[PDB]
Amino acid sequence: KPGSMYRNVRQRSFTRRKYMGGVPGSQVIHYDMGDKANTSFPVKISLIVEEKCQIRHTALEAARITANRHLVADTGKMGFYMKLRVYPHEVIRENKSGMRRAFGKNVGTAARVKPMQKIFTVAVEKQNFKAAKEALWHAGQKLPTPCRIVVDEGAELVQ
Amino acid sequence: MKGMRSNIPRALNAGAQIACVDNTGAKVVEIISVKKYRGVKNRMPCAGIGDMCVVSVKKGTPEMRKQVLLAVVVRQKQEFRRPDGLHVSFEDNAMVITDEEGIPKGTDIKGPVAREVAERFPKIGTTASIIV
Amino acid sequence: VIDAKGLILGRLASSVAKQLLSGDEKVYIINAEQAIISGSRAATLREYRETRERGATEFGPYFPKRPDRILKRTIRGMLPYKRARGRDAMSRLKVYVGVPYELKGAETVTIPDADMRLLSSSRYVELGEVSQKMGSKF
Amino acid sequence: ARFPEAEERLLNKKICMKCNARNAIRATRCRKCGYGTLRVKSKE
Amino acid sequence: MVKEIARTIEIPEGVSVSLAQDVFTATGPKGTVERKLWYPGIMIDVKDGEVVVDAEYARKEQKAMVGTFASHIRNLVKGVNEGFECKMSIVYAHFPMQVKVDGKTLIIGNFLGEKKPRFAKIIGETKVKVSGNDVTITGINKEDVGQTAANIEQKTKIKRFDPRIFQDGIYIVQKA
RNA sequence: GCAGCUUGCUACCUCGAUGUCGGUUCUUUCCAUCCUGGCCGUGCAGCAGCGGCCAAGGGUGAGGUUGUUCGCCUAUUAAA
RNA sequence: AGCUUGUAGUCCGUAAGGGAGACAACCCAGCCCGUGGUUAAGGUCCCCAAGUGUCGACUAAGUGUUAAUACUAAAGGGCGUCCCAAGCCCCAGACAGCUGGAAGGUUAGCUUAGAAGCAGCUACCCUUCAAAGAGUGCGUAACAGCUCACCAGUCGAGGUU
Numbered sequence: 001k002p003g004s005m006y007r008n009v010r011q012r013s014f015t016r017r018k019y020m021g022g023v024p025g026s027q028v029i030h031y032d033m034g035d036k037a038n039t040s041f042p043v044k045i046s047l048i049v050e051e052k053c054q055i056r057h058t059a060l061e062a063a064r065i066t067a068n069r070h071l072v073a074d075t076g077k078m079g080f081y082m083k084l085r086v087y088p089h090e091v092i093r094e095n096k097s098g099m100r101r102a103f104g105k106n107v108g109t110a111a112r113v114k115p116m117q118k119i120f121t122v123a124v125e126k127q128n129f130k131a132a133k134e135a136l137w138h139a140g141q142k143l144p145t146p147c148r149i150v151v152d153e154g155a156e157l158v159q
Numbered sequence: 160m161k162g163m164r165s166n167i168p169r170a171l172n173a174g175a176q177i178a179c180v181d182n183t184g185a186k187v188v189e190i191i192s193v194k195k196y197r198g199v200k201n202r203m204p205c206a207g208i209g210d211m212c213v214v215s216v217k218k219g220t221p222e223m224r225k226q227v228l229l230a231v232v233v234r235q236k237q238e239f240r241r242p243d244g245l246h247v248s249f250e251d252n253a254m255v256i257t258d259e260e261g262i263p264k265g266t267d268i269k270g271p272v273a274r275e276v277a278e279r280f281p282k283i284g285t286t287a288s289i290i291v
Numbered sequence: 292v293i294d295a296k297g298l299i300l301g302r303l304a305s306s307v308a309k310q311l312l313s314g315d316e317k318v319y320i321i322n323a324e325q326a327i328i329s330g331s332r333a334a335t336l337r338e339y340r341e342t343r344e345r346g347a348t349e350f351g352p353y354f355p356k357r358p359d360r361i362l363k364r365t366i367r368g369m370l371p372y373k374r375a376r377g378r379d380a381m382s383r384l385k386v387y388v389g390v391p392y393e394l395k396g397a398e399t400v401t402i403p404d405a406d407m408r409l410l411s412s413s414r415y416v417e418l419g420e421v422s423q424k425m426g427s428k429f
Numbered sequence: 430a431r432f433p434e435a436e437e438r439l440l441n442k443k444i445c446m447k448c449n450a451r452n453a454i455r456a457t458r459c460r461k462c463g464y465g466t467l468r469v470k471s472k473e
Numbered sequence: 474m475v476k477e478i479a480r481t482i483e484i485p486e487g488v489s490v491s492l493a494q495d496v497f498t499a500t501g502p503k504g505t506v507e508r509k510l511w512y513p514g515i516m517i518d519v520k521d522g523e524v525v526v527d528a529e530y531a532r533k534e535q536k537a538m539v540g541t542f543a544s545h546i547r548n549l550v551k552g553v554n555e556g557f558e559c560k561m562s563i564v565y566a567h568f569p570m571q572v573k574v575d576g577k578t579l580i581i582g583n584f585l586g587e588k589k590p591r592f593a594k595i596i597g598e599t600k601v602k603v604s605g606n607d608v609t610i611t612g613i614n615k616e617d618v619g620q621t622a623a624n625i626e627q628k629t630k631i632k633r634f635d636p637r638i639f640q641d642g643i644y645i646v647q648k649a
Numbered sequence: 650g651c652a653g654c655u656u657g658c659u660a661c662c663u664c665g666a667u668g669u670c671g672g673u674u675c676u677u678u679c680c681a682u683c684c685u686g687g688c689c690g691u692g693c694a695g696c697a698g699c700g701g702c703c704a705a706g707g708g709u710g711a712g713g714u715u716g717u718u719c720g721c722c723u724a725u726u727a728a729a
Numbered sequence: 730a731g732c733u734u735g736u737a738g739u740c741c742g743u744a745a746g747g748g749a750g751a752c753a754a755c756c757c758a759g760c761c762c763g764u765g766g767u768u769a770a771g772g773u774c775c776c777c778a779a780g781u782g783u784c785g786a787c788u789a790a791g792u793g794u795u796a797a798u799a800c801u802a803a804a805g806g807g808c809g810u811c812c813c814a815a816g817c818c819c820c821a822g823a824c825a826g827c828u829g830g831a832a833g834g835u836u837a838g839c840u841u842a843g844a845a846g847c848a849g850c851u852a853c854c855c856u857u858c859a860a861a862g863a864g865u866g867c868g869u870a871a872c873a874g875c876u877c878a879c880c881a882g883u884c885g886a887g888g889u890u
């Protein structure tokens with residue numbers, strides 16, 4: 001289905017596993033990227049959201065893939081630590097008769113967000129800051145909401 | 160093609176059956192379409208003297224029969240006028256099996272042919288014997 | 292008489308329309324072919340071309356081509372020409388291309404408001420140019 | 430025939446990579462659509 | 474520091490400049506040239522071998538216009554003092570060309586097997602001279618000579634083939 | 650994201666009746682361009698191609714099966 | 730979905746009169762008859778009663794000139810233009826140009842003859858002088874110069890992220 005079919009937040013949440021049935025799995029495999037064992041990156045930037053919405057897991061997977069490729073290509077395999085944050089807990093249902101017993105059935109999973117809520121986070125050195133911004137800008141292109149980039153730690157270093 | 164001195168009405172009509180007058184091996188043909196003719200709505204394609212048109216063999220030898228070929232009209236029963244003022248007509252329509260250029264497959268033509276096809280297609284002129 | 296030498300079109304039309312409606316003697320606009328229409332060249336030409344070719348032949352809008360006809364039509368819209376007051380007002384207006392012989396040497400006045408000197412930039416066209424672009428010999 | 434002046438004023442220009450408009454040499458911006466990337470007119 | 478929007482031109486001896494009404498007039502040993510440079514918000518004065526031009530608002534449009542007018546004034550005085558020249562060149566592979574000056578046009582005959590010779594207009598008093606495989610274009614008006622050269626170049630362009638293999642016409646080896 | 654040119658969803662108007670599908674005749678409108686006019690790129694030598702931009706003035710036909718729209722096929726044609 | 734089914738308030742149904750272009754339920758107002766007066770909503774270039782009103786800026790697109798609204802186009806981009814803040818270099822001299830320099834060695838490793846800075850390991854090819862390079866490109870079997878990066882003289886005020 002199209003992206004805008006399930007993107008607005010108009011109705012209550014629907015997430016209790018034990019009551020619904022037959023929720024399909026997910027594609028996102030790993031939520032931590034890069035050098036997990038390192039903890040000495042002085043710059044910590046992140047991608048934030050400007051509006052409430054629902055993000056499908058497929059969009060998150062595409063954004064993660066593109067950011068991974070860019071960061072590994074330019075910064076290096078050991079020069080960063082990316083970490084996705086929001087996990088998809090919501091469930092999406094698509095009716096499939098007419099309006100007779102129109103209640104839908106599970107077709108997917110989505111992750112609700114909130115304004116100014118961090119989605120991604122990348123830590124790098126001082127020399128690979130522009131590459132980090134370049135990587136995080138492409139990832140927000142696959143995402144269903146307007147997105148801005150905020151440098152959380154080491155702002156005085158970069159700025 | 161090269162212009163003709165005379166004016167030729169388009170007498171024969173797509174669907175007509177003509178008696179081919181050469182020694183190639185066919186007797187009767189069926190005009191399917193006319194080369195270099197656009198047309199308008201509802202109008203059947205038509206052909207006159209010195210018009211190259213694709214036909215179909217209806218009566219003839221078994222090898223030639225059921226073959227789409229090219230041919231031109233050498234006579235027509237519908238009158239047409241000379242440059243200096245006169246009208247010429249024939250008793251019967253006729254056609255000769257040829258190629259795209261104009262070389263007729265037959266080396267012998269029976270009966271007269273109009274002189275205007277003789278000027279447009281010189282080969283038909285030479286291969287003929289009597290021209291009127 | 293009023294000289295339309297270098298005056299804004301709508302400003303001139305509004306002033307003339309109001310002081311026709313107030314009720315007086317008749318008024319004369321001369322040189323109604325170098326009145327100014329502020330705006331870029333292309334937009335003005337486009338809008339006037341669309342206005343020109345818009346009607347149906349039996350009953351559609353017949354937009355005029357001559358310059359004084361255009362100015363008269365522009366004033367015709369700021370005025371209740373279907374009522375009796377508006378028709379009487381329209382009977383007392385005369386816009387001439389150039390200067391007619393009888394109004395030769397006549398005393399003139401101008402609307403001090405509608406002045407091209409009161410315009411920020413040089414983005415304007417003159418009425419005769421649009422008239423000739425619409426295909427009129429004047 | 431490859432001559433200096435002809436190549437100088439014929440095939441020494443950059444090409445917008447989106448609308449195919451030809452630009453000047455020392456440029457980085459299509460003059461009609463503003464696309465960032467400009468290639469160079471193909472040589473032999 | 475300051476964003477003052479004034480410009481001086483320092484007119485040289487010989488040129489009798491003026492700013493009557495709006496048209497800017499000059500005269501010198503190389504004839505005379507005329508131009509009109511009116512624009513709201515941009516005032517120009519002529520005095521003591523120099524023309525001062527400036528504006529009032531520091532908007533970038535005003536600054537661009539003051540630069541443009543100063544450049545035009547410099548080019549006008551330079552043209553009237555001595556003049557401006559443009560050099561071009563001829564190239565051909567198989568078909569020799571007959572460049573011949575006649576009237577106010579330059580006729581190009583036998584261009585790539587051409588029976589109908591092409592026509593290039595000459596603007597103003599821009600006297601052109603043909604000599605073998607090169608053309609020299611004299612004049613006192615800079616825009617005039619530039620536009621004449623542009624017309625001559627644009628008329629002789631072959632527009633149905635490949636520039637790799639066909640390269641003929643007239644090309645500018647040096648601008649005005 | 651656009652269109653409302655396919656099929657769906659709804660039940661706001663019409664049941665003291667708004668005469669259905671296809672074809673025929675005749676007139677007109679749109680452009681999201683098949684040909685004709687003008688340009689740009691090419692992994693464009695020429696011929697002929699491939700991709701894109703402006704442009705709605707004119708053209709866009711004849712036949713076999715089938716009630717067919719749609720679709721298949723035939724010989725022309727600048728394009729059908 | 731101008732869809733379907735709930736809930737609190739107020740309305741139309743059964744609600745005049747004034748204003749919204751016309752508008753069942755939107756704003757002012759809930760209305761016996763006649764006369765005078767001042768205001769509400771909303772407006773004041775002309776149609777049309779009353780401002781071609783005042784102060785400070787923005788827009789160049791006829792964009793706009795459309796309270797709510799079933800009647801109003803999105804992501805993305807803009808060295809288009811107007812502002813704020815933060816860093817960096819700076820008249821003993823910053824940027825764009827005018828200039829040349831980019832000489833030591835090398836012709837780098839390369840089998841094809843040859844990919845000799847520009848297929849394919851390497852490393853700053855000079856102890857040293859602004860410059861001197863394993864180096865981009867017109868050229869380029871390989872190159873080569875021409876020279877990239879990279880600094881140096883030169884103007885003469887702001888430049889740049």
Ligand SMILES: [Mg+2]
Nearest residue numbers: 740741743744
């Ligand atoms: Mg009530």
Ligand SMILES: [Mg+2]
Nearest residue numbers: 744745746747
């Ligand atoms: Mg009411």
Ligand SMILES: [Zn+2]
Nearest residue numbers: 445448459462
């Ligand atoms: Zn472009």
